[PDB]
């Protein structure tokens, strides 16, 4: 029997979107090889340093309960992505924000948001089918090293260590990670491989451990499903698969167009983090052949297959699906009910 506050329509949608945008910015700053970090205040002592997107998402709550609803929903998106794969939480968050934003923009009296959500789901199914079609399997230790290096912010040593551990204990053997008291990283087997991470301080060790865990999750996903073009170009090459779709009604077309517009968000964010204009980069990615992407680290155009800029199919698929499933549902909102602050 607690007093509640009721908001209708556009005010509620805008108040959701404010929190969604705040959390999505705070997460998306940590995207890509040029991405930066986030300092999170800790109550029990030293603040923690995390480039990990889902930690940034889960570490943010907003006083306004209306904005807190959207913040907690994008937090749920990121948490589901982490629970399913363990990487690409930033990509899932930016996709969720973009889908929710485009859904809120195209809301009117005549627009049926439920059929828009149905169209979003249909387009997501089609693009996941295209993703599985385009993916290729892993057949080389060099590919494992590349996956672990790209997943760990370009740390060649971490990629080499993970590749060595996978070679030593097999691609299915158990590997864990724990902090080492040394200044460098060492691998020992006593089998089951255990990775000991070195660093000059607890915060640096924690950050490197997060990167190592991300790389390990990505390489396990790669061996489980396969790899696709990295740098967000997998979505940018699956985009034509939506043009072959024939929507049933208008709202289906609205959903398909919204998903097609959101497909280029990850490449836009990756380019934007590297001090350049995202839209031109996405345009040139699409104009290029099916084997050319933008190397965000070096700031030029290369062949991603040769350069080792690749990502697992599982990460991108789960990120896109988890973002769509929650963002489209939030789009169907008309009334929000929050508890009055006491």
Ligand X SMILES: Nc1ncnc2c1ncn2[C@@H]1O[C@H](COP(=O)(O)OP(=O)(O)OP(=O)(O)O)[C@@H](O)[C@H]1O
The site for K ion (CB under 5 A) is made up of 30-31, 51-53, 90
Q: Exactly one of 90, 135, 219, 262 binds ligand X (CB under 6 A); which one?
A: 90
Contact 140, 243 (CB under 8 A): no
Residue 14, binding choice from Mg ion, ligand X, a copy of itself, none, Cβ under 5 to 8 Å by partner class: a copy of itself
Which lies closer to ligand X via its Cβ, residue 53 or residue 103? 53
By rule CB under 6 A, what count of residues binds ligand X?
Answer: 28
CB of residue 305 vs a copy of itself: minimum separation in angstroms? 23
Q: Which residues, 6+ apart, have CB-to-CB distance to 4 below 8 Å?
A: 337, 338, 339, 340
Q: Exactly one of 151, 163, 206, 269 binds Mg ion (CB under 5 A); which one?
A: 151
Residue 313, binding choice from ligand X, a copy of itself, Mg ion, none, Cβ under 5 to 8 Å by partner class: none
Q: Using alpha carbons, select from 107, 83, 80, 106 the residue that is nearest to residue 93.
A: 80
List b or e across 240-278, with b for residues whose CB sees 16 or more CB atoms inside 10 angstroms.
ebbeebebeeebbbbbbbbbbebbbbbbbbbbbbbeeeb
80 scored as a contact of Mg ion (CB under 5 A):
no
311 scored as a contact of ligand X (CB under 6 A):
yes
- Cα-based angle 37, 162, 150 (whole degrees, multiple of 5): 45
Q: Exactly one of 16, 24, 31, 236 binds ligand X (CB under 6 A); which one?
A: 31
Q: Interacting stretch for ligand X, rule CB under 6 A, among 82-90, 124-132, 162-170, 275-283?
A: 82-90
Contact 217, 84 (CB under 8 A): no
Q: Which residues pair with 312 in a beta bridge?
A: 227
Q: Which residues, 6+ apart, have CB-to-CB distance to 64 below 8 Å?
A: 15, 18, 19
Spatial separation of the C-alpha atoms in residues 110 and 296, rounded to whole Å: 42
CB of residue 240 vs K ion: minimum separation in angstroms? 28
Residue 295, binding choice from a copy of itself, Mg ion, ligand X, none, Cβ under 5 to 8 Å by partner class: ligand X
Half-sphere exposure of 280 (CA within 13 A, CB side): 8
CB of residue 8 vs K ion: minimum separation in angstroms? 16
Which lies closer to Mg ion via its Cβ, residue 138 or residue 254? 138
Confirm or deny that 262 is annotated as ligand binding. Answer: no
Which lies closer to K ion via its Cβ, residue 90 or residue 206? 90
Spatial separation of the C-alpha atoms in residues 282 and 186, rounded to whole Å: 40
Confirm or deny that 101 is annotated as ligand binding. Answer: no
Q: Residue 87 burial (CB < 10 Å; 0-12/13-18/19+)?
A: buried
- In 134-270, beta strands by DSSP E: 175-179, 186-189, 193-197, 227-229
Token pair for 74: 């994008």
Please, which of residues 193-212 interact with Mg ion by CB under 5 A? none
Confirm or deny that 255 is annotated as ligand binding. Answer: no
Q: Exactly one of 19, 49, 71, 87 binds Mg ion (CB under 5 A); which one?
A: 87
Contact 8, 335 (CB under 8 A): yes
Residue 54, binding choice from Mg ion, ligand X, a copy of itself, none, Cβ under 5 to 8 Å by partner class: ligand X
89 scored as a contact of ligand X (CB under 6 A):
yes
Please, which of residues 202-261 interact with ligand X by CB under 6 A? 214, 230-232
Annotated binding site for ATP: 51, 87-91, 231, 311
The footprint of Mg ion (CB under 5 A) covers 87, 151, 214
Binding residues: 51, 87-91, 231, 311
């Amino acid at each position: 029997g607690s007093a509640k506050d009721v908001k209708f329509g556009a005010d509620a949608r805008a108040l959701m979107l404010q929190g969604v945008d705040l959390l999505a910015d705070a997460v998306a700053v940590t995207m890509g090889p040029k991405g930066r970090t986030v300092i999170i205040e800790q109550s029990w002592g030293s603040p923690k340093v995390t480039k990990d997107g889902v930690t940034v998402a889960k570490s943010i709550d907003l006083k306004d309960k209306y904005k807190n609803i959207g913040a907690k929903l994008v937090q749920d998106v990121a948490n589901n992505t982490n629970e399913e794969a363990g990487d690409g939480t930033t990509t899932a968050t930016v996709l969720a924000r973009s889908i929710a934003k485009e859904g809120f923009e195209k809301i009117s009296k005549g627009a049926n948001p439920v059929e828009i959500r149905r169209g979003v789901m249909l387009a997501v199914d089609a693009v996941i089918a295209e993703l599985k079609k385009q993916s290729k399997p892993v057949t080389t230790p060099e590919e494992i090293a590349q996956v672990a290096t790209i997943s760990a912010n370009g740390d060649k040593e971490i990629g080499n260590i993970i590749s060595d551990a996978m070679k030593k204990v097999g691609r299915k053997g158990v590997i864990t990670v724990k902090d080492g008291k040394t200044l460098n990283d060492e691998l020992e087997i006593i089998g089951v491989a255990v990775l000991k991470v070195g660093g000059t301080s607890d915060v640096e060790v924690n950050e490197k451990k997060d990167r190592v865990t991300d790389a390990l999750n990505a390489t396990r996903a790669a061996v489980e499903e396969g790899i696709v073009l990295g740098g967000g170009c997998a979505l940018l090459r699956c985009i034509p698969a939506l043009d072959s779709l024939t929507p049933a009604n208008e709202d289906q077309k609205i959903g398909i167009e919204i998903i097609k517009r959101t497909l280029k968000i990850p490449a836009m964010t990756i380019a934007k983090n590297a001090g350049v204009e995202g839209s031109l980069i996405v345009e040139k990615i699409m104009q290029s052949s099916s084997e050319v992407g933008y190397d965000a680290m070096a700031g030029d155009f290369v062949n991603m297959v040769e350069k080792g800029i690749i990502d697992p199919t599982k990460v991108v698929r789960t990120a896109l699906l988890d973002a769509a499933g929650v963002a489209s549902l939030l789009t169907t909102a008309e009334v929000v009910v929050t508890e009055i602050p006491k």
